[PDB]
Design a protein around this nucleic acid. Sequence first.
RNA 1: GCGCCGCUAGAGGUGAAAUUCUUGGACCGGCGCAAGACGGACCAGAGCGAAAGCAUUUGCCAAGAAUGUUUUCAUUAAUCAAGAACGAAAGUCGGAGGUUCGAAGACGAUCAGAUACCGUCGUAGUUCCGACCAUAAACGAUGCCGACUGGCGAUGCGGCGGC
Lengths: 64, 137, 214, 91, 102, 103, 101, 82
Amino acid sequence: RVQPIKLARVTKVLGRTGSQGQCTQVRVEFMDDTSRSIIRNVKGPVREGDVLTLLESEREARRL
Amino acid sequence: ISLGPQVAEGENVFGVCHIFASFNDTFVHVTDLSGKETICRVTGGMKVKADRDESSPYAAMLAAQDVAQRCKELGITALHIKLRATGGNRTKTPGPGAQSALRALARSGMKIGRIEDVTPIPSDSTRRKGGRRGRRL
Amino acid sequence: VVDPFSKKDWYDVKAPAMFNIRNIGKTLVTRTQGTKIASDGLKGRVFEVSLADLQNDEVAFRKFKLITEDVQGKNCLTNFHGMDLTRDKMCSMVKKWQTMIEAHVDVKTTDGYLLRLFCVGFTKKRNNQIRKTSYAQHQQVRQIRKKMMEIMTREVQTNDLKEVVNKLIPDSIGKDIEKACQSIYPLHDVFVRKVKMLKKPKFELGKLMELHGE
Amino acid sequence: AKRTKKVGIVGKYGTRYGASLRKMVKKIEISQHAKYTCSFCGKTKMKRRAVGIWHCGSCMKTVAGGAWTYNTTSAVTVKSAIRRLKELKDQ
Amino acid sequence: TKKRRNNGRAKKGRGHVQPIRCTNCARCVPKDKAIKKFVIRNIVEAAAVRDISEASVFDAYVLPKLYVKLHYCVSCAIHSKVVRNRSREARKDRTPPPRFRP
Amino acid sequence: TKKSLESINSRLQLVMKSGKYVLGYKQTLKMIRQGKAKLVILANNCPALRKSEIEYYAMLAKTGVHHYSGNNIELGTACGKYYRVCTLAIIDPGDSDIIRSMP
Amino acid sequence: PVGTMPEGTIVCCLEEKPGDRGKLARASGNYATVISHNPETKKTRVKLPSGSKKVISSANRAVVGVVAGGGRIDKPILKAGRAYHKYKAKRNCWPRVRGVA
Amino acid sequence: PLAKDLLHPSPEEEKRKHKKKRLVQSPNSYFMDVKCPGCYKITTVFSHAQTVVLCVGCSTVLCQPTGGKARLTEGCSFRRKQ
RNA sequence: GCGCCGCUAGAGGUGAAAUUCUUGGACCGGCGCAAGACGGACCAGAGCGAAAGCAUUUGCCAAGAAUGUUUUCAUUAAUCAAGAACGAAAGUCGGAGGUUCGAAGACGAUCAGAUACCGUCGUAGUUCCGACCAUAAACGAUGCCGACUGGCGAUGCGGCGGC
Ligand SMILES: [Mg+2]
Ligand SMILES: [Zn+2]
Ligand SMILES: [Zn+2]
C-alpha cells in the first residue's frame, strides 16, 4: 500500500494486446538494477527508451 | 509486552501458512508451527464487495497484505507454505488466488521456507457431481 | 471483545537427541483458565517438519510427524510418530514405462511399537537399453515384494525402537532392499515411503527422557 | 412326479391371499422348515423350534440364531466386527 | 464413411476399459478416448522467483514443481484449443508436438 | 484361501491309496494305546473332551497330533469316503511324508 | 461396561443409569452402537435403534452382541388367524375398530 | 523373387525355419551322451527330456527337466552323439 | 458426517445470480473415531477371456491358450435346425445397506414461454446376498474353419543360438 510511486524505463516493444490494439506491452525496468523486470501493459504510443510511471509494482502478468 | 516469543535478532520463528487456492474464493489462513493455533484466517472474499472479484487475483493480493500486517504483529516471522486446491473429487490445479497470494507475501517483507502442494488426492473415490454427460455450459 | 493473543504463552519444541538440530520451533498456547490447563492442551500435537531443517546435510523431501508426549516448563518434549515424503517428489519418480512395485507390512518392535512400513520401488532402465518398456514379469514382482517387507521385518523386529528410527535418516533400510533386489530385477528409486504408528505403550516416562539426555 | 410349477410350499394356501404375498412367503417358508447342517456335530439335524431357537436333533445342542433362518447376515456382519476389535486396538 | 482406421479410440483387443470423468465438464469418457495433457508447471510461476528468493531462508533452494494431470474430454479439448482440427493427409501420425522450450 | 492345503490333504489322500489307516474314535483309541498309532488327526468339529484326551494319550504314547484345519465332514473328502470323521490315526504309511509334515 | 469397549462396537440390552440391569435395545434384532467416549467427565454416547444418540453414563454395564430373533417382521402375518394368537398371548387390544365407523 | 529354387537350397536356411515347414520334417532334438561326475555308465538321455534322470551308479539327479531343453546338474562330461 | 480444541464473519455457489449453510458460532487448520462405496499417478494402439467384461496385498482351489516334446491314441474332424450355458447398464422382487452421485419431484435462476441445459435439496436407484427379464452402436457396423499370395521396423508369451 505505502510504496514510493516509481518511474520506469522499458525494454523492447512486445506488441499489441487488449483485443483492440489499445494496449501496448513494454516490460519496464525499475531504475535501480538491470535484472529486476516485470512484463506489463500500458496504453499510449511508446517510443522505446521512454520512462513511464507505476502506481504500484505488484499486480499481474499477462498470461491466461 | 505479551506478544512474541523471546527470539534473537538475526534468527526467525516458523509458523506454517495454509493457502487454499481454489475457485470462487481463497484463504491465506496462517497458523503456528504445528498448524493448530489459528493466528490469522483472513480471506480475500471478505475484503471485496463484488462477488465476481472474490476469486480475483487483486483480492488475493491484499489478502496477503492483511495477514502479513498481522503476522509481524504477534511475532511470528517466517512462513512455510502449504498451498492447497479444491482437491480430491474436484479439480486440483490452483485457482487465481495462488500466485497473487504468494508473490504479494514475499514483497511484504516476510521470509519463506518450504512451499508445498498439499491439495487432497484420492485413490479412485467419490463419484463426481456432474452426471454422466457432465455439466454442460 | 478482548485481544486473544495476549492471554497466551510461547513454549519451545525439542526433538529427541537422536538428531542433530534440537530446537524445532515454538508452539503457543493459552494459559490455565479453570479446567483447560497448559499441558494437555498441547500434549499429542503433531509437528510436520522436514529433515533439512532438522539435520545438517540430509535431503528435504522426507519429513517426520512428532507427538509432544510431555512438557517440562518452557520445554515441549516430543517422540517419534511417523514419516512420509513430499508428494511432488513422490510423484516425480513415477514415470511412464516403468512398473511401480510396492509393499506394506505391519511390524512391531521389542517395546510395543506396532509400525506399518510402506516401501515403494521402481524398475530401472539400464545404460544401453534400447527398448522402452522396462517392465517386469509378475512372478518377478511377487518375490520382489516378498523381499522388500521381509528385510524390513528384520530391520525392525530384531532390535528396539531407537535403532529403527535411527536407521532411516540416510535411508538405510531403503538402500538395503536396493542392494538385494537388483539380482532379480534392477531398481533405482527405492524410498521407505511412509511409516504409520498405531500403538503407544502405556506412556512410561522413562524411555522419554532417555531420548532427552545427551 | 413334478406336480406343480410355481407354488412349491405355498400350494397349501391355494387360491387365496394374493400372489406377491405368496411369492414373498415361499422364500421364508422353505427356509424355516429346512434341515440345516449342524456346525457342532457335522450332521444335518437343525430343527426350528419356537422362533429364534434352533436345535440340533442329535448332539442335543441348542443355538439361539436367527428367526426365519439360522445365520442372519446381520449377525455375521457383527461377528466379523467383534473378532476384528479383538485385534484392532486389542480391546 | 469411416473417419479413422481405429474407431476413434485406442483399444483393439478388449471389450471394456476404465471409465473416467473429464476435468472441467466432469463428463464420463473411457480412459482410452480422452485427451490427456500432463502438466509439470513450475509452481512459483518463475517470473515470481527473484522476488521470493531474497525471502527464502537458504541460498541454494530447490524450488518445487506441480504435477497436475489434465485429461480433458474430447468435447472440451477442441473448445479450449488443446487439440486442433487436422487435415485428412496430415491425420495419419502419432508424433507428439515439438517442444520449443525457449 | 488360495494355494496351501495341497500339503495336508494330498499327503493324506495318498495314504488313502497305500498306507494303513483307521477311521473313527475307538479304532484309533485301540491304536493309540498299543503304540502302533503314529500320527492322530483331529478335525475342527470334535467335542472338546474328545479333542483333549486323545491329545492326552498322544502325550502318553509319544506320538504326534495334527489339527486338521477343517470340518469333520470336510475331512471326509480329504479322506475319500462318504462319512464324517473327527479322528483318524495313520499307522503305517506306504511312502508318504505325513510324519515329515509341518509338526 | 461401555467405558472399556472400543467405539463402533455393537451392543444390545444395556442400562440407562448404572445398575439398572438392562433397559435399552432389547427387542428382536436391535443393537445400540457405542461411540465417542469422553475420557474425563466419564460419559459416553450410544446410538439407540431409533437413530437418536444418547449420552449415558460411562459405567453402564452392557452385553456385547445383537439380539437373536432378528429379521422377524420380514414375513407377513398373511391371514387374520395367526394375528389373533400373536395378540392373545400379549394383551387384549387386537380387533381395533376404527373411530369413524 | 520369381527365381528362388525351393528343392535344393542351402542346408543352413533349411535350418533357419520351423521343425515343420522344411523340405522334410525333422526335430531339433537328439540323443546326447552324458557321463555323470563320479561314475562309469554313459547315459543316453534325451535332449528335450521331461524327467528327473537318475544313473546306474550315481543315485542322484542327473538333469533338471525344464521348459525347452533339460539342464544337467553339473556341467559334465558331455558330447553330442550320432 | 460425528465429536473435540483454535479462530474470525461470512462461507458456499454462478456468465452474473439467488434458494441454502451460518455469532446455540459454520467455512478453514489440527487430533481422532465411525460408516460406506471405489481401488487414481504406474495404465499403453499391452496382456487375459467364447462374449459381455477383468487393476490394492497375501492368499483353499479349479480352468486355459501358447511354447517344449524321436510321447500317446490313429480319423476320433468342420459348420451346425430342434434345443442348451453364459450375457453390460437400466428394470422388477425380497433382505441387509445407505458414503458419494442422483431418474422423479420440490424450489432458485435465465427466459417471450422453461415441466430443460446451470445451482442447493432430494425419493427410487447406484452397494452386497439371492430369485428374475436376454435387450444394446452386445461395433471390427466385417459368421466360423482352412489354404495360398508383398515387405519393413516394432510388440507380448514361450523356445533356440550367441560379442
Ligand atoms: Mg381398523
Ligand atoms: Zn448338531
Ligand atoms: Zn470436458
